[PDB]
């Protein structure tokens, strides 16, 4: 009865708003007013104000819907979203976020704003700068709501990824400061959004983010240790990937500054159980072609003796072997000779792995085979003088 | 679950930007060791650069298509504004030049069909001869 009528009711606003001639199209009429210089400005603000209520009204029905009637509303909303340009969309929508009192509606308004920028270009740079100042100011207000908090951070992440470099620098630094503070948030969602924003922000800023470096890496390493402890976390896999992807982005952008703390980075990769091996093995490579190999080989000895040797983890050992073989096949003539005593010291420990190893004979034999080929690769590529004492 | 979906979407985006070829988020121990070592070389041999190219080209087409749609749409609205202003005599200086250009464009086009001045000279001369015999007028 009412539902059948109500189902019919939304066919109208779909039919009328559907963009099936200058005169007929509601969309086209809007631009003519905007393009028309003689049109009163007080007339324009009516269009902006009127649209905001219309967009809020349709969202309310969507929020409070019935599958077929639910489907029609999106057809209506899609027509509504395209009535007016991005220039007027942001002006007529950004004020409504604070005005809106419903958490569901605020959750909806954030999504639509991002969708408009999904297909925009450099023309919206001044628009995007305005949006950030609003979104940044709403973050302390919306800290209570996780879903709203997560979405706002996600929207910032997508758009800092897209032409983020062209955005005014003050916003970027403020976003980075905002993200680092939210990393400590207890809720897993805020962290992964916080880590995600740091990756892009560090990517754009590059060396200019070095000031925040003490606030990025040391917390992340501590976060990873907590990540292992809470294995019941439903987002453990997503959280761990975020930590790894955080390192991967900054391994590309700030290699030199990370060499000192490179050891803990490897500790993250080796012992990140939930993440896929392909994810880990990929970021192993990036270390090789971005960070000085000589530092790596020094660290490979320490990590092996400290953790990997007693780890008794198949994945960790295999990942360690993949690192060592990759380094030796890339390390240069001069660097290999200089670092030779440490490599041989590591080699002796590797030979002695059978004594302490808890794995079966087949594994240890296969592991030993990988050790021998790299040693043959490493002993080759040096001169007589360096090798004679070591022999 | 929006927590979950939003969580995945963000990390999935990061993965494509940084590790395009890596898959997205959705037995004997010796065999495991061998597999990982094999995965190293093939991943090293993966052709990531063309993957990055493909996603760019896909995105560029969508942005280009929308840009054309905006470019087309505003011209129709722009031309509409010219109609209403012209009918009401609200023409601005800019609008009085665009139409004036159209006068030149159309008038320039009609000149080609108007033919040359050199040809009309003998055409006119031939034209009179044929009239005067068929129209007569001696009587």
């Amino acid at each position: 009865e009412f539902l059948t009528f109500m189902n019919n009711t939304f066919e109208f606003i779909n039919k009328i708003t559907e963009e099936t001639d200058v005169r007929r199209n509601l969309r086209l009429k809007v631009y003519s007013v905007l393009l028309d210089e003689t049109s009163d400005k007080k007339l324009i603000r009516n269009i902006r104000e009127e649209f905001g209520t219309l967009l809020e009204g349709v969202l309310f029905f969507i929020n409070s819907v019935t599958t077929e009637i639910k489907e029609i509303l999106f057809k209506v909303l899609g027509n509504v979203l395209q009535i007016l340009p991005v220039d007027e969309f942001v002006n007529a929508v950004l004020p409504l976020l604070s005005t809106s009192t419903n958490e569901d509606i605020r959750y909806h308004l954030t999504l639509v704003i991002g969708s408009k920028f999904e297909l925009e270009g450099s023309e919206a740079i001044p628009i995007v700068n305005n949006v950030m100042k609003v979104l940044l100011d709403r973050m302390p207000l919306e800290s209570k709501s996780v879903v709203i908090s997560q979405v706002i951070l996600n929207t910032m992440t997508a758009l800092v990824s897209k032409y983020g470099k062209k955005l005014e620098g003050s916003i970027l630094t403020q976003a980075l400061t905002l993200a680092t503070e939210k990393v400590s948030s207890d809720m897993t969602e805020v962290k992964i959004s916080s880590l995600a924003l740091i990756t892009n922000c560090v990517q754009v800023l590059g060396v200019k983010s070095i000031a925040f470096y003490p606030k990025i890496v040391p917390p992340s390493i501590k976060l990873f240790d907590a990540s292992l402890a809470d294995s019941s976390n439903p987002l453990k896999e997503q959280l761990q990937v975020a930590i790894l992807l955080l390192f991967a982005g900054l391994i590309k952008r700030i290699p030199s500054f990370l060499m000192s703390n490179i050891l803990d980075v490897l500790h993250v990769i080796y012992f990140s159980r939930e993440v896929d091996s392909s994810i880990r093995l990929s970021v192993i490579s990036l270390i090789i072609e971005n960070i000085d190999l000589k530092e790596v080989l020094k660290v490979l000895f320490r990590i092996w003796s400290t953790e990997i040797a007693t780890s008794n983890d198949t994945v960790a050992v295999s990942l360690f072997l993949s690192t060592l073989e990759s380094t030796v096949e890339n390390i240069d003539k001069k660097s290999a000779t200089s670092q030779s005593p440490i490599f041989f010291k590591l080699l002796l420990s590797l030979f002695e792995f059978r004594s302490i190893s808890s794995f079966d004979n087949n594994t240890i034999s296969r592991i030993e085979a990988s050790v021998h080929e790299i040693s043959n690769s490493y002993v080759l590529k040096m001169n007589d003088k360096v090798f004679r004492p070591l022999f | 679950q929006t927590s979950k979906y939003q969580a995945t979407s963000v990390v999935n985006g990061l993965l494509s930007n940084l590790l395009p070829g890596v898959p997205k988020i959705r037995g004997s121990k010796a065999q495991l060791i061998d597999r990982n070592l094999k995965k190293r070389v093939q991943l090293q041999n993966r052709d990531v650069h063309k993957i990055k190219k493909k996603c760019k080209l896909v995105k560029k087409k969508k942005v280009k298509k929308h840009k054309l749609d905006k470019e087309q749409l505003e011209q129709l609205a722009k031309h509409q504004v010219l109609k209403k202003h012209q009918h009401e005599g609200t023409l601005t200086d800019h609008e009085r030049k665009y139409l004036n250009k159209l006068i030149k464009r159309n008038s320039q086009n009609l000149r080609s069909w108007d033919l040359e001045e050199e040809v009309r000279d003998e055409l006119e001369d031939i034209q009179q001869s044929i009239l005067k015999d068929t129209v007569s007028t001696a009587n």
């Binding site: 969507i62 929020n63 569901d104 959750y107 909806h108 639509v112 969708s115 | 979906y5």
Partner: peptide
């Protein structure tokens, strides 16, 4: 003719976010 017959035969993202929130 039956033989001929056999021969004849032989020859939105935000929408998802909206719905998934309502389910919660």
């Amino acid at each position: 003719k039956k033989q001929v017959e056999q021969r004849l035969e032989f020859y939105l993202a935000i929408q998802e976010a909206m719905e998934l929130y309502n389910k919660d």
